[PDB]
Structure 1
Amino acid sequence: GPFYLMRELPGSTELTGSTNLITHYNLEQAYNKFCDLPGMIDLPGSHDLRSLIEKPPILSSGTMLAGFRLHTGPL
C-alpha cells in the first residue's frame, strides 16, 4: 500500500531561490534607478602620481603652531 520510507515534504513555498529575491528584499527601486562621480564631483571642482599615493594610502588603510611656523616670503 504505502511505499517504503515515505515522509512529509517541506512547507509548500518557503524561502527559495526561485522567488524574486530583490523585490522581496525591497531593493527594486534602486535597481530601476540604476539599470563618473569624478565627473559628478568635477561639477564642483576643477578636474579629477601623488593621487596614486592617495589611492595607495587608501589601499593601505597645533594649527596655530603651523600658521606661526609657516614663515615664507612672497616673491
Structure 2
Amino acid sequence: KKVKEKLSNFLPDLPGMIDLPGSHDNSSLRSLIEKPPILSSSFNPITGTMLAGFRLH
C-alpha cells in the first residue's frame, strides 16, 4: 500500500498546518521533544490576573 499517507489521515483532526516541519514553524517551544525541558516548577492554578490580562476587547 502507499506509505506516503499524509501527516494527515495521521494527525488529521487537529486544525492548522500539522504537516509543516519544526524548522518552518520556527518555534522555540516546539524544540522540546529533541531535548527534554527541566520541570523547574509544578503546574499552578489559573488566577484572576490572567483573565484581567485577556478578556479580549
Name which one, 1 or 2, has greater alpha-carbon Rg: 1
Q: Between the two structures, name the one with larger relative contact order (CA 8 Å, sep ≥ 6).
A: 2
State the TM-score, normalizing by the size of structure 1: 0.33
TM-score where L is the length of structure 2: 0.39
The answer to which structure has the higher helix fraction is: 1
